[PDB]
Design a protein around this nucleic acid. Sequence first.
DNA 1: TGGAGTACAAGTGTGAGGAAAAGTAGTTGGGACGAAAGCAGTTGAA
Length: 49
Amino acid sequence: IVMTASAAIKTPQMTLPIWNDVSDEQADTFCKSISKVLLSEVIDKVIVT
DNA sequence: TGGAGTACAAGTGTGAGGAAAAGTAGTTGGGACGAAAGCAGTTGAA
């Protein structure tokens, strides 16, 4: 912050307030709609013959 | 009964020897407490 005035922070974050009518089950479904999903994450095996 | 030759010693010049403790002659030994970060004008080619 004080030195270097870095536009490239190591861990840039963003805090998102959710509404007062949206629930926790609706919000956990919502976090999945944003997060990056590699194709690696859904693969159990790759068998190559 | 006088002289002709002649070895024994009194007597006279030439250099050659003797010695030592000082110095100097050739080899070998030895002398040399530093494998740091995000960042920026220049600068890579697209």
